[PDB]
Swiss-Prot record, chain A:
This is Ribonucleases P/MRP protein subunit POP6. The lineage of its organism: Eukaryota, Fungi, Dikarya, Ascomycota, Saccharomycotina. It comes from Saccharomyces cerevisiae (strain ATCC 204508 / S288c). Its EC number is 3.1.26.5. One of its GO terms (molecular function) is rRNA primary transcript binding. Residues 50-70 form a coiled coil.
From Swiss-Prot, chain B:
It is found in: Cytoplasm; Nucleus. GO terms for biological process: intronic box C/D snoRNA processing; maturation of 5.8S rRNA; nuclear-transcribed mRNA catabolic process, RNase MRP-dependent; rRNA processing; tRNA 5'-leader removal; tRNA processing. It comes from the Eukaryota. The chain holds residues 2 to 146 of 173 of the full protein. Component of nuclear RNase P and RNase MRP complexes. RNase P consists of an RNA moiety and at least 9 protein subunits including POP1, POP3, POP4, POP5, POP6, POP7, POP8, RPP1 and RPR2. RNase MRP complex consists of an RNA moiety and at least 10 protein subunits including POP1, POP3, POP4, POP5, POP6, POP7, POP8, RMP1, RPP1 and SNM1, many of which are shared with the RNase P complex. This is Ribonuclease P/MRP protein subunit POP5. GO terms for cellular component: cytoplasm; nucleolar ribonuclease P complex; ribonuclease MRP complex. Belongs to the eukaryotic/archaeal RNase P protein component 2 family. Keywords: Cytoplasm, Hydrolase, Nucleus, rRNA processing, tRNA processing. It catalyses: Endonucleolytic cleavage of RNA, removing 5'-extranucleotides from tRNA precursor. Present with 2230 molecules/cell in log phase SD medium.
From Swiss-Prot, chain C:
Present with 846 molecules/cell in log phase SD medium. Component of nuclear RNase P and RNase MRP complexes. RNase P consists of an RNA moiety and at least 9 protein subunits including POP1, POP3, POP4, POP5, POP6, POP7, POP8, RPP1 and RPR2. RNase MRP complex consists of an RNA moiety and at least 10 protein subunits including POP1, POP3, POP4, POP5, POP6, POP7, POP8, RMP1, RPP1 and SNM1, many of which are shared with the RNase P complex. The chain holds residues 767 to 875 of 875 of the full protein. It comes from the Eukaryota. This is Ribonucleases P/MRP protein subunit POP1. Signal peptide: none annotated. It comes from Saccharomyces cerevisiae (strain ATCC 204508 / S288c). Required for processing of 5.8S rRNA (short form) at site A3 and for 5' and 3' processing of pre-tRNA.
UniProtKB/Swiss-Prot annotation, chain D:
Its EC number is 3.1.26.5. This is Ribonucleases P/MRP protein subunit POP7. GO terms for biological process: intronic box C/D snoRNA processing; maturation of 5.8S rRNA; nuclear-transcribed mRNA catabolic process, RNase MRP-dependent; rRNA processing; tRNA 5'-leader removal; tRNA processing. Pfam families: Rpp20.
Length: 157, 145, 109, 121, 242
RNA sequence: AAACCAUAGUUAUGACGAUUGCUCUUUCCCGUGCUGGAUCGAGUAACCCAAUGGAGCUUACUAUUCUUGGUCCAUGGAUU
RNA sequence: AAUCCAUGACCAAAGAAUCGUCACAAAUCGAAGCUUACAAAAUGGAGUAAAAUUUUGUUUACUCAGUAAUAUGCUUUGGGUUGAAAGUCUCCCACCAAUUCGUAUGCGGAAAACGUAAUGAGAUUUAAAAAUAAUUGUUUAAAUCAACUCAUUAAGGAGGAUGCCC
């Protein structure tokens, strides 16, 4: 619990507290990888923890996909994000939503990205430090095929 | 019963001895300023003669005679400053100490000789050299960003 | 019995039970004791145990290649199994005078 | 209630198994790095393009760690995919002092989320 | 991991103010040490036993690693420690160690006379014993004092840098290091590089071969150097903290 | 275009430190004696070294340059 | 002639073991290994705490798998390895109810220019070794013993005779 580093820059974060890291991910890492100003996208952000209900999260997700206006010609994108051990529950909620949504003869188009936080801890000896890496998975799911977002650094799924 | 050979890998590193010019502190910057290049006046018979002179001056007569029986430079090119010298397994430590005690070239000053890998086969030496060359490119690619 | 640290077993090996006075030393050795350099530390003095601690014999002792350690196939007594409150057990060879530490697991065969 | 879990069906032809590491929950980090480097070197002589890294359940976290390690350390393209894995579980149904191992069996399917991680050269 | 414990600071007295060129040369030589491959660096600062110690605690160390080398520390990724040697000649102008032991981390000594060795082996809270390898040793290294100062924990420091200065002092350095090896009986031997220029620093292989040909076995060199340097760093840090 | 595979694997098996055991000689002790114990020492050799795996045969080895068991209508000394 | 002691000659067996150490998110004089992906937390997990909501439902802040994994580390062994790795020696390493050594031949053996057992004889005057396939510095013997070569003895069950304990 010595320090948190992202993009070779030191940040004031805490791995044990989920709220601060989730707000940091919502506010910093996403705008530097996707720009919602020069496009026609409506982005709905959502962070997933391990203490959240799966059914309630799916009830949030199937609503967040049909909240924006359809007359404006909006492509509605949902940005689900998590970090650490909560990524397992994040994937479970994503797959359950996919199973519940594809049943109606539709298709879900997904783009994935994997980055990492770098933290430092005390090693075995007092004169040695260990560097741990915490994964960060960001998924963008939408019903339309074409998105004008800069998603060349993602992976098509 | 069997002639046991042992090759030594050594490298020429030039320290940035310049107090009037401030330097950048990082990994790849100092790697590049230490691996700049070798001068033009660099050869195999010019390094062998220098190391023989140094060995005869530091160890002595018998100390140079016992090591100069199988003291040869097998492979060396001035483009990267990596050479492979052949020697016996009995006098290998003496050759390493002579490489350490190398003061300077007859015309070129301010250089360090660093022994990196020593083994009794050339295949593993080449493998370790390839691994080191591959590792060198990583910090370079990372710092070019 | 699987060896959890440095050691190599063989067939016809002796199985000793960890004593009660030297119970924290083996636990610390199983947790970790490193040198100031950073690597592990096995160069210490061994607390040789007593003689009345024979509880089993290893019949099939060979270096396990599936996990990377030394697997020992022995047969321990049930009374001594219920005696100890821990699963730690010492292994010794027939000619070697060193005692390795490990943990045994019951096989339903 | 007593219930055991068998592994999941793996259908590998001849080479999909070779260039693929299945990360267990007890698999160390450095051993995974070593085997991944060996696979990365042996792929183009096996004749493939990427190295598959498959993990499910508890090992997903360190699988993503292995992925993001080679992502920036060696600067190699990575691809992450989210898949579903069906596992068969053998349970005892109620319907003489008999061992619980030798009892009536019933198969049940269970779906779990998993991550496939491909690494380019 | 490797440890160097004898990097000299270009300053002898306290009135001596540092020069930017000296700091640049020290940066160059530390970068060269990190280039050849090292993990722990402990810069040394020399002072005379006859000089007046300051009536300060916030000014005992004219180094302040945090403000000068603190940027190199988190950029290149090494560590720096404080070490001070004591050039002691006779029992006068002294009797103060409790205030110099709290500021610095490692305390060394440099005896050059008969009574200097006795006073170093009697009541000096020191860790390393350093001799003038360049010039002649004071009288004769005997077992009666060396054994007694090694059995308590004080090791003997060998400077392989002084050899690479000129050609004439090489003979004296060899004749002194072999006497130290013969007297210490090869137990408490720690080595350091007392070079101020980046042209007089070597690697582990060359130094190991040199000390092996000079009279120390290959087990002693490695084990002593590594573990004893780590242990002296550890006990220095512990006595600095508590 | 691979079939690449060794509880050594392609001529690599390095550097020293410490402990136990064996041979003879040096001495002590209980109860002649004991795979007896303890110092003062030396020696741990020679033949020779793998290149895919196994078996058989023959040929080199052990003199203060380690050892062990038995045999001899071989000689040398002593008793009946 | 019996026993003991010392030397010499000849035959046969074996090749003492144990512990610790050696920089570089990789290394070493080298080598192998730590991959049948899950903690029944996916039948859309189990609960606690606050607001509002006429209970549901929804928004925040937490607990539970704890025998928990612990970041180039960690464990093992490495020249006689079946006592000779040495040697221009021999043979196996695909089958063939059969032009394919269809060979029940002293015994064992898949084969072996392979081990051993009982008897008789032999020495360039001999079946063959020397003074007109492999190996070995000497390279079997030539009073007796010991060693080499060649020539005979097919497996199992039943009856009679002889010798031993009885
Ligand atoms: Mg051969």
């Amino acid at each position: 619990i010595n320090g948190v580093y992202y993009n070779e820059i030191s940040r004031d974060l805490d791995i044990s507290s989920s709220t601060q890291c989730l707000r940091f991910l919502k506010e910093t890492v996403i705008p530097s990888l996707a720009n919602n100003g020069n496009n026609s996208t409506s982005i709905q952000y959502h962070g997933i923890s391990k203490n959240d209900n799966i059914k309630k999260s799916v009830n949030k997700l199937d609503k967040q996909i049909n909240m924006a206006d359809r007359s404006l010609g909006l492509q509605q994108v949902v940005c689900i994000f998590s970090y650490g051990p909560h990524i397992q529950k994040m994937l479970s909620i994503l797959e359950i939503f996919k199973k519940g949504y594809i049943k109606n003869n539709k298709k879900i188009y997904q783009w994935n990205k994997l980055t990492s936080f770098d933290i430092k801890r005390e090693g075995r000896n007092e004169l040695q430090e260990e560097r741990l890496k915490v994964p960060i998975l960001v998924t963008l799911v939408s019903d339309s095929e074409i998105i004008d977002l800069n998603l060349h650094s993602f992976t098509k799924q | 019963v069997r002639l046991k050979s042992r090759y030594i890998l050594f490298e020429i590193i030039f320290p940035p001895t310049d107090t009037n010019v401030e330097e950048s502190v990082s990994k790849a910057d100092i790697l590049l300023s230490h691996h700049r290049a070798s001068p033009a006046d660099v050869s195999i018979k010019s390094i062998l003669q220098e190391i023989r002179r140094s060995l005869s001056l530091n160890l002595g007569d018998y100390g140079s005679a016992k090591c100069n029986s199988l003291l040869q430079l097998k492979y060396f090119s001035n483009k990267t400053s990596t050479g492979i010298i052949r020697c016996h397994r009995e006098d290998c430590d003496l050759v390493i100490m002579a490489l350490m005690l190398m003061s300077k070239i007859g015309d070129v000053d301010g250089l360090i000789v660093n022994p990196v890998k020593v083994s009794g086969t050339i295949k593993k030496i080449e493998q370790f050299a390839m691994r080191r060359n591959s590792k060198i490119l990583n910090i370079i690619k990372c710092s070019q960003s | 019995c699987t060896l959890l640290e440095r050691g190599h077993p063989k067939d016809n090996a002796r199985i000793y039970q960890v004593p009660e006075k030297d119970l924290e030393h083996w636990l610390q050795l199983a947790k970790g004791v490193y040198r100031p350099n950073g690597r592990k530390d096995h160069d210490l003095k061994i607390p040789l145990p007593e003689v009345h601690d024979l509880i089993g014999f290893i019949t099939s002792g060979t270096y396990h290649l599936n996990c990377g350690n030394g697997m020992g196939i022995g047969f321990i007594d049930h009374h001594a199994a219920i005696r100890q409150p821990t699963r730690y057990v010492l292994i010794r060879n027939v000619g070697t005078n060193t005692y390795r530490l490990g943990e045994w697991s019951k096989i339903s065969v | 209630k007593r219930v055991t879990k068998h592994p999941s069906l793996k259908t590998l032809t001849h080479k999909q198994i070779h260039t693929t590491i299945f990360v267990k929950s007890t698999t160390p980090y450095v051993s995974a790095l070593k085997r991944i480097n060996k696979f990365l070197d042996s792929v183009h002589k096996q004749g493939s393009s990427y190295v598959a890294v498959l993990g499910m359940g508890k090992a997903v976290e360190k699988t993503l760690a292995l992925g993001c390690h080679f992502q920036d350390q060696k600067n190699k393209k990575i691809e992450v995919y989210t898949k579903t894995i069906e596992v068969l579980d053998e349970v005892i149904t109620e319907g003489s002092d008999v061992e619980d191992d030798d009892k009536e069996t019933q198969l049940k399917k269970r779906a779990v989320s998993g991550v496939e991680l491909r690494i380019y050269v | 991991m490797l440890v160097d414990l004898n990097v000299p600071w270009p300053q002898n007295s306290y009135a001596d103010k540092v020069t930017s060129q000296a700091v640049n040369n020290l940066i160059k030589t530390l970068s060269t040490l990190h280039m050849l491959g090292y993990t722990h660096i402990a810069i040394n600062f020399t002072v005379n036993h006859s000089e007046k110690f300051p009536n300060d605690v916030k000014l005992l160390n004219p180094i302040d690693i945090k403000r000068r080398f603190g940027e190199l520390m988190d950029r290149t990724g090494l560590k720096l420690y404080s070490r001070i040697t004591l050039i002691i000649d006779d029992p006068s102008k002294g009797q103060s160690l409790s205030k110099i032991s709290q500021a610095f981390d490692i305390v060394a000594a440099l005896p050059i006379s008969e009574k200097g060795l006795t006073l170093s082996t009697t009541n000096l809270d020191i860790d390393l014993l350093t001799f003038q390898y360049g010039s002649r040793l004071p009288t004769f290294l005997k077992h009666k004092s060396i054994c007694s100062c090694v059995n308590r924990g004080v090791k003997l420091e060998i400077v392989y840098g002084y050899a690479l200065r000129d050609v004439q002092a090489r003979r004296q350095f060899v004749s002194n290091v072999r006497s130290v090896i013969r007297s210490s009986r090869s137990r408490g031997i720690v080595i350091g590089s007392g070079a101020m220029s980046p042209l007089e620093c070597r690697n582990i292989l060359g130094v190991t071969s040199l000390i092996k040909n000079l009279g120390l076995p290959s087990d002693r060199c490695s084990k002593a150097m590594g573990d004893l340097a780590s242990l002296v760093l550890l006990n220095g840090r512990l006595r600095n903290k508590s």
